[PDB]
Subunit: 160 residues, 4 copies
């Protein structure tokens, strides 16, 4: 079978993601728009092993390993879009992707950025439309920036 | 100030939780019913340092540190009830409680058990009310047992 | 059997240290002078599980867990004396004590402080007398202090 | 400056190793023979940031990150020869190479394989010369195999 990680040392037979199970979804410009699953996963299953390059600096497409070290993965896990009600969890100790919900073929895989990331490279507005969405997305240890308040501290006019 | 953790080694002025900020909710007997905040917390703030005793075995009131080690904390963090839309996050590398969202004084503190735990000592039905609530709660690496599959099926009659 | 950790939740049958295997060695004043073993351990064996209290601050009797968190263990592992040729290793991920060398009953268990500790609460002079001893003991990420140089930067007179 | 790691994502000015500081020693063919420092390093200094590729399987040139994950680094840190009295320490939480003692320009860089590795892809006889050298090298959680027990016994004839 064939794998997403371009390195030849990561084999699909060991658990690494296969293009027969996962699909990188593209924008109009040939950029990032998440990852689509193409087999059906029941919740509580390991969907894939994760790899990448060790780096000391948080960036786009890095995932946090521990307090000072991150995993640079522009091929797979770093492409996952945020959601406030994710269907997948990143286990950054075993380096594995696990189904939180039941996931049907064709569904978009989503993760809560704040469950792994202290801070993000860029805070942003969320469109998962979950009623419990946070609207403005930051790392778990990161305060909203000055744009962030506005959308937040403004949408608190929804008092009425 | 006086602290939730019995140990006199852990000091409130170093960020360990104080009863003037956290109330432990008990039932008619001794079994617990969550932790409530007495003060308001803005999102993205450290609410408390966490502590406990190292142990090798997952248990009631343990939180997972790494693949084979767990933190036994029956005084504070192991008392947090689960929710599928939690207001707090447990950081098990720095051992700290952070607010995921704005928390009003009096609010119950809830965490997603699956975001730290591989497996749970017991699976159980969830009543978080949330629209996206998984209804049946396991560890992240744990399949629903037959009871859980049954309820999950009886709910799939929709 | 009976265990060193005073907490009753840590059982000897699960691997936690027993006073039938280990002995806390005392000074003249009822203070710390290491840990003596009283069974024979071949190298490459797990001698004991380790426990203690989570703390955020490095102290005497704390062992480093990760970049910002330490294990306060005044009962067992924090009593171990330094050596530049240790016979035991602390596995701070599994929380376990393992024999590096062959260890005969009655031997003192010793560990290289710099293999787990970024910095120490107090730097000190070493007396393991190993020919490859470092003489002045610091954490792995810690420079000798101003006393430290002297013993070091002086004992480099041993040029002749 | 030009860096040991092929990846152009890792920059020397951020502390990743440079060939003006580190020389990789090759044998008559392609198999390696250690890493040598070209500059002097005082003890207690960060000599390099480390990197590599995450992998699930212990292997030649992997260093262990945690109980089930390993760092594949055939360019730098996985090339360090073992010594029972090493001059450098690998920090696998911060991913950095630190000097344990004073290191003169030209010196070989050596680490104690047992201080990071549970088990080794292969056990082997050690020639560090040190008085306290264990003579036979395994992982920290690994018993000497029959070859190693034999040599350890043939040495016990002392
Ligand atoms: C999608 S990877 C996790 C977030 C990334 N580090 C960022 O800052 O955008
Ligand atoms: C509230 S502590 C987290 C889960 C606990 N270890 C259990 O199994 O019940
Ligand atoms: C013997 S426990 C490890 C060293 C201790 N943290 C100290 O600073 O002395
Ligand atoms: C120099 S890399 C450390 C050990 C390596 N994993 C091996 O088994 O050979």
């Amino acid at each position: 079978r064939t794998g997403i990680y371009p390195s030849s040392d990561l084999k699909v037979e060991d658990g690494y993601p296969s293009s027969d199970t996962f699909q990188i979804i593209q924008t109009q410009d040939g950029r990032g728009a998440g990852v689509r699953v193409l087999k059906t996963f029941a919740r509580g299953r390991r969907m894939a092993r994760v790899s990448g390059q060790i780096t000391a600096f948080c960036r786009l497409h890095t995932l946090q390993i521990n307090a000072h070290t991150h995993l640079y993965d522009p091929h797979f896990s770093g492409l996952l879009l945020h959601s406030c009600v994710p269907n997948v969890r990143l286990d950054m100790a075993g380096f594995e992707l696990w189904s939180l919900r039941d996931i049907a073929a064709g569904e978009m895989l989503t993760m809560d950025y704040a469950s792994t990331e202290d801070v993000l490279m860029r805070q942003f507005e969320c469109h998962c439309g979950a009623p419990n969405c946070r609207r403005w997305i930051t790392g778990a240890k990161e305060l909203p920036n000055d744009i962030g308040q506005a959308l937040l501290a403004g949408l608190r006019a929804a008092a009425l």
